[PDB]
Amino acid sequence: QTWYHEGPNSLKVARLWIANYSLPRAMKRLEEARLHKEIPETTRTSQMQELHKSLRSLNNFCSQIGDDRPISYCHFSPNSKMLATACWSGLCKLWSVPDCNLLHTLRGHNTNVGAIVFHPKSTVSLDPKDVNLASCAADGSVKLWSLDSDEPVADIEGHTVRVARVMWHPSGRFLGTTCYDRSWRLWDLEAQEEILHQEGHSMGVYDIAFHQDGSLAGTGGLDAFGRVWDLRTGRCIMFLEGHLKEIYGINFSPNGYHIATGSGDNTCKVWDLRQRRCVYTIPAHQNLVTGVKFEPIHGNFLLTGAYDNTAKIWTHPGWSPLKTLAGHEGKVMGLDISSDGQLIATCSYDRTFKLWMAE
Amino acid sequence: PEIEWWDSYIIFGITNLVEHPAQLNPPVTLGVYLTKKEQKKLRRQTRREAQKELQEKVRLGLMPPPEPKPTKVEAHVRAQMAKRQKAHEEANAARKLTAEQRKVKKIKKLKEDISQGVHISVYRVRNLSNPAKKFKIEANAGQLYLTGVVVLHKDVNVVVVEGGPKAQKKFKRLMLHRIKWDTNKCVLVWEGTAKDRSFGEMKFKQCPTENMAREHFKKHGAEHYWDLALSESVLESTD
Amino acid sequence: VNPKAYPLADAHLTKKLLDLVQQSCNYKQLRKGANEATKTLNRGISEFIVMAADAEPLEIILHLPLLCEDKNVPYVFVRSKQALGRACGVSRPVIACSVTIKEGSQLKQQIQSIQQSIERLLV
């Protein structure tokens, strides 16, 4: 019963922009993956054994208290020098990482902050003054931040209920936003206007994750059904289900195949896109799985959060448990892997955020 | 892969059309409690209408009134109190859960409502070739209405259990505390939930090498429990 | 409801919650009242706190989430104070209840299961 609705032409020019941004990204990604396949398997498998020898030696260093309230989300910046945490108070602190000194907490929220997400061109291509961060809260609130203001720049007022998560397009011009309207919105930064309000779930949408080539955007929410939208066509490309409980985290892999949706039924599920299957249902944790993040640019492993006190590394593909990053005293609420692959941070309900590294 | 299939779909397929696709359903009653004064009032008013309707049935005249309460007189009243205690044992003799009403009520206690999703334990044991403990596992999985498998292998044999949560808690109380194993220990490998139940019933499948055990699991669409338990077993064996 | 009432128990969970609170009232493990829940959170003898989303104003129990984060105690909001009050065996509305630890009492398995279930609700 796919109902269609006319949108504004801002959506159409934004979709043609997303097409002409994503297609060269997808061509370059597929050609670089074809060049990664053509090198001999001795070098590739030795490189993955190199990486697994590093990943089994992921020891905790610099665990630091965030607030008197439990932290809900961390997101590594590009340049991997800052780390934006999101406490359940209004504060959205930014720690200079790996040193974990605080840098200019962001005040301006009232209820429980959900995610704060750095811009994809924040450190590398975005000046400090321009919008750099985007937080979201348990009331109707999404608001952008700079790195030097400590009180936000122009908020987003299209929401009335709890926004669960936020993620940027790999452009940065677009800002996906799961709401609890059983829908997710897609804000735009050039036009400064909400271009898209996609209702495709039966219950509230929790986490959105954009394809790293920029074409797709997976969602997935409390209806236990994850969607995979194309930005260009609307048009939910690969409906995915097999979870029975609330999907709490999506991530797309830097190789364009996989989507690992981690859900409330303690599984994680690695789906293909060139097969439309559920390739492997990782029996991940003892309690529900919130944060699921692949590695950046090479994308060789899969890190799952948990509402038991752990976070686990699974190889990719193969999905064997490389290392349990245990040690927290509370539930691991959100995580992110640094964009060089060298650093891994998980916030928690223990009010701490940590860093795991190779020794 | 030359171009991934959404890119082949567009290369033009775009215009100002956002859509509302195929909403799918996600895959209530409240009990009434009373304060103790309301229990007293409800009991006393039910009893007052009960005494009123018994005196009503005396007032219609269907029966003479019930039994009101030197060897001869209390021998009479001894026969009448034997009649009274016998009537108490009659009212306990009917309404007794005769021989199988206990069985159906124990069943409706133990057999939960698993659709609404099935809770799955996965255990690994180092060795359960002991007959008594594999009997406890098989019999308590069958009796708690738990489904699953015990595949058998050297140093990691896998017990996938699959039922309602109140049975899952009893099985983990059994498997982790009640079954006293001993170098042989049992751990809880996984405790999650899946959409609906996979296995047939607790059947001790077995192969001494790993690939056929993974094939037997992959018959059920449940190979991930095997790969998880095997990999954490060999990682504990290395560490 | 109130958006600051978080986490909010759905119908199946609040049925299990009110039956566990009723059993704890029977087992004398229950402390009714926001002041008694504050006391048993301060003494650290509380298994878990249930609260009422239809308490007006809500903030007269909204200190109790903060106490449940400084004592590591699970907290959850029931839909209405009248159902929670009846579930404590009193005819008056009760907005905050503390199911408390006792010496090896028989509700510890139900209390542990409800603790694991209502620490999944805050997500």
PDB file of C-alpha atoms in Angstrom, chain A residues 1-8 11 15-16 23 26-27 29-30 34 182 198-203 215-216 223-225 227 229-230 232-233 235-237 239 241 243-244 256 265-267 273-274 276 280-281 283-286 314 320-321, chain B residues 1-7 9-27 114 116-120 122 172 188-196 214 221-229 231-232 235 239:
ATOM      1  CA  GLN A   1       0.000   0.000   0.000  1.00  0.00           C
ATOM      2  CA  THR A   2       2.755   2.437  -0.923  1.00  0.00           C
ATOM      3  CA  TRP A   3       1.150   5.877  -0.837  1.00  0.00           C
ATOM      4  CA  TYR A   4       2.901   8.724  -2.650  1.00  0.00           C
ATOM      5  CA  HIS A   5       2.884  12.410  -1.743  1.00  0.00           C
ATOM      6  CA  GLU A   6       4.036  15.496  -3.611  1.00  0.00           C
ATOM      7  CA  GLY A   7       6.934  17.290  -1.969  1.00  0.00           C
ATOM      8  CA  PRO A   8       8.469  20.703  -2.596  1.00  0.00           C
ATOM      9  CA  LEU A  11      13.490  18.124  -2.081  1.00  0.00           C
ATOM     10  CA  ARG A  15      17.938  14.768  -4.334  1.00  0.00           C
ATOM     11  CA  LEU A  16      19.697  15.627  -7.582  1.00  0.00           C
ATOM     12  CA  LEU A  23      27.442   8.534  -7.650  1.00  0.00           C
ATOM     13  CA  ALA A  26      30.033   5.127  -5.165  1.00  0.00           C
ATOM     14  CA  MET A  27      32.121   4.742  -8.341  1.00  0.00           C
ATOM     15  CA  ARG A  29      34.394   3.265  -3.619  1.00  0.00           C
ATOM     16  CA  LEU A  30      33.661   0.380  -5.981  1.00  0.00           C
ATOM     17  CA  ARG A  34      38.043  -3.695  -6.883  1.00  0.00           C
ATOM     18  CA  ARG A 182       6.915   7.212  13.700  1.00  0.00           C
ATOM     19  CA  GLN A 198       9.586  10.380   5.783  1.00  0.00           C
ATOM     20  CA  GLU A 199       7.005   8.281   7.601  1.00  0.00           C
ATOM     21  CA  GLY A 200       7.763   4.622   7.012  1.00  0.00           C
ATOM     22  CA  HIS A 201       7.582   2.891  10.378  1.00  0.00           C
ATOM     23  CA  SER A 202       4.668   1.764  12.492  1.00  0.00           C
ATOM     24  CA  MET A 203       6.310   2.814  15.762  1.00  0.00           C
ATOM     25  CA  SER A 215      23.343   7.565  -1.527  1.00  0.00           C
ATOM     26  CA  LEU A 216      21.433   5.551   1.083  1.00  0.00           C
ATOM     27  CA  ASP A 223       8.709  -1.077  15.363  1.00  0.00           C
ATOM     28  CA  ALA A 224      11.537  -3.688  15.088  1.00  0.00           C
ATOM     29  CA  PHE A 225      11.667  -3.113  11.312  1.00  0.00           C
ATOM     30  CA  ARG A 227      14.304   0.506   6.646  1.00  0.00           C
ATOM     31  CA  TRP A 229      15.886   4.479   2.123  1.00  0.00           C
ATOM     32  CA  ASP A 230      17.475   5.904  -0.918  1.00  0.00           C
ATOM     33  CA  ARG A 232      17.277  10.109  -4.189  1.00  0.00           C
ATOM     34  CA  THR A 233      13.990   8.279  -4.688  1.00  0.00           C
ATOM     35  CA  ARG A 235      11.446   4.523  -1.968  1.00  0.00           C
ATOM     36  CA  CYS A 236      12.511   2.182   0.880  1.00  0.00           C
ATOM     37  CA  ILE A 237      15.093   0.144  -0.955  1.00  0.00           C
ATOM     38  CA  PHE A 239      13.070  -3.469   4.029  1.00  0.00           C
ATOM     39  CA  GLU A 241      13.308  -7.588   9.462  1.00  0.00           C
ATOM     40  CA  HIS A 243      14.448  -8.594  14.644  1.00  0.00           C
ATOM     41  CA  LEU A 244      11.443  -8.786  16.891  1.00  0.00           C
ATOM     42  CA  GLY A 256      28.988  -0.849   0.430  1.00  0.00           C
ATOM     43  CA  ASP A 265      16.547  -8.521  21.391  1.00  0.00           C
ATOM     44  CA  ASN A 266      20.291  -8.792  22.234  1.00  0.00           C
ATOM     45  CA  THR A 267      21.199  -9.690  18.650  1.00  0.00           C
ATOM     46  CA  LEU A 273      22.594  -4.908   0.198  1.00  0.00           C
ATOM     47  CA  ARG A 274      23.725  -6.722  -2.935  1.00  0.00           C
ATOM     48  CA  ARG A 276      19.014  -8.134   0.344  1.00  0.00           C
ATOM     49  CA  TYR A 280      24.711 -13.113   9.708  1.00  0.00           C
ATOM     50  CA  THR A 281      22.792 -12.668  12.940  1.00  0.00           C
ATOM     51  CA  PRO A 283      24.348 -13.315  18.962  1.00  0.00           C
ATOM     52  CA  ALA A 284      26.034 -10.292  20.388  1.00  0.00           C
ATOM     53  CA  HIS A 285      25.264  -9.553  24.012  1.00  0.00           C
ATOM     54  CA  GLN A 286      23.412 -10.587  27.134  1.00  0.00           C
ATOM     55  CA  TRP A 314      33.529  -8.836  15.788  1.00  0.00           C
ATOM     56  CA  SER A 320      33.919 -13.959  15.528  1.00  0.00           C
ATOM     57  CA  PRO A 321      34.320 -12.137  18.864  1.00  0.00           C
TER      58      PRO A 321
ATOM     59  CA  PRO B   1      29.986  -5.884  -8.897  1.00  0.00           C
ATOM     60  CA  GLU B   2      29.981  -3.211 -11.615  1.00  0.00           C
ATOM     61  CA  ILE B   3      27.499  -0.762 -10.037  1.00  0.00           C
ATOM     62  CA  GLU B   4      25.352  -1.528  -7.023  1.00  0.00           C
ATOM     63  CA  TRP B   5      21.734  -1.950  -7.859  1.00  0.00           C
ATOM     64  CA  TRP B   6      20.266   1.331  -6.609  1.00  0.00           C
ATOM     65  CA  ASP B   7      22.845   3.192  -8.706  1.00  0.00           C
ATOM     66  CA  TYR B   9      18.170   1.904 -10.886  1.00  0.00           C
ATOM     67  CA  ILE B  10      18.867   5.637 -11.090  1.00  0.00           C
ATOM     68  CA  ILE B  11      21.489   5.293 -13.818  1.00  0.00           C
ATOM     69  CA  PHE B  12      17.065   9.084 -13.809  1.00  0.00           C
ATOM     70  CA  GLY B  13      14.370   8.069 -11.360  1.00  0.00           C
ATOM     71  CA  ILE B  14      14.008  11.119  -9.146  1.00  0.00           C
ATOM     72  CA  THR B  15      11.475  13.930  -8.702  1.00  0.00           C
ATOM     73  CA  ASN B  16       9.609  15.694  -5.884  1.00  0.00           C
ATOM     74  CA  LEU B  17       7.942  12.555  -4.549  1.00  0.00           C
ATOM     75  CA  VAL B  18       8.392  11.427  -0.961  1.00  0.00           C
ATOM     76  CA  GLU B  19       6.320   8.388  -0.129  1.00  0.00           C
ATOM     77  CA  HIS B  20       4.607   6.381   2.616  1.00  0.00           C
ATOM     78  CA  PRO B  21       5.580   2.723   2.151  1.00  0.00           C
ATOM     79  CA  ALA B  22       3.772  -0.387   3.304  1.00  0.00           C
ATOM     80  CA  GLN B  23       3.509   0.163   7.058  1.00  0.00           C
ATOM     81  CA  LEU B  24       4.127  -3.158   8.807  1.00  0.00           C
ATOM     82  CA  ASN B  25       2.837  -4.079  12.265  1.00  0.00           C
ATOM     83  CA  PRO B  26       5.475  -4.475  14.971  1.00  0.00           C
ATOM     84  CA  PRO B  27       6.261  -8.129  15.655  1.00  0.00           C
ATOM     85  CA  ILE B 114       5.830 -17.683  23.260  1.00  0.00           C
ATOM     86  CA  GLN B 116       5.355 -12.463  21.139  1.00  0.00           C
ATOM     87  CA  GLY B 117       8.832 -13.846  20.650  1.00  0.00           C
ATOM     88  CA  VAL B 118      10.904 -16.626  22.133  1.00  0.00           C
ATOM     89  CA  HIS B 119      13.722 -16.226  24.650  1.00  0.00           C
ATOM     90  CA  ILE B 120      16.841 -18.193  23.748  1.00  0.00           C
ATOM     91  CA  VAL B 122      22.824 -20.679  24.524  1.00  0.00           C
ATOM     92  CA  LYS B 172      19.489 -21.044  33.821  1.00  0.00           C
ATOM     93  CA  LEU B 188      26.043 -18.826  29.714  1.00  0.00           C
ATOM     94  CA  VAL B 189      27.139 -18.014  26.177  1.00  0.00           C
ATOM     95  CA  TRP B 190      24.106 -16.030  25.041  1.00  0.00           C
ATOM     96  CA  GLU B 191      20.692 -15.018  26.344  1.00  0.00           C
ATOM     97  CA  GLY B 192      18.619 -13.237  23.736  1.00  0.00           C
ATOM     98  CA  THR B 193      15.309 -13.315  21.929  1.00  0.00           C
ATOM     99  CA  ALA B 194      14.284 -14.287  18.403  1.00  0.00           C
ATOM    100  CA  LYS B 195      11.109 -13.812  16.398  1.00  0.00           C
ATOM    101  CA  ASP B 196       9.781 -17.330  16.694  1.00  0.00           C
ATOM    102  CA  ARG B 214      27.734 -26.201  12.075  1.00  0.00           C
ATOM    103  CA  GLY B 221      19.049 -21.276  10.659  1.00  0.00           C
ATOM    104  CA  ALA B 222      20.903 -21.124  13.977  1.00  0.00           C
ATOM    105  CA  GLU B 223      24.593 -21.481  13.079  1.00  0.00           C
ATOM    106  CA  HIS B 224      25.513 -18.257  14.849  1.00  0.00           C
ATOM    107  CA  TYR B 225      25.108 -19.860  18.274  1.00  0.00           C
ATOM    108  CA  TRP B 226      27.600 -22.520  17.207  1.00  0.00           C
ATOM    109  CA  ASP B 227      30.127 -20.088  15.768  1.00  0.00           C
ATOM    110  CA  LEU B 228      29.851 -17.864  18.837  1.00  0.00           C
ATOM    111  CA  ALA B 229      30.222 -20.691  21.368  1.00  0.00           C
ATOM    112  CA  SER B 231      34.966 -19.078  18.992  1.00  0.00           C
ATOM    113  CA  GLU B 232      34.688 -18.003  22.622  1.00  0.00           C
ATOM    114  CA  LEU B 235      39.544 -18.009  22.731  1.00  0.00           C
ATOM    115  CA  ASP B 239      43.922 -17.150  26.759  1.00  0.00           C
TER     116      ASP B 239
END
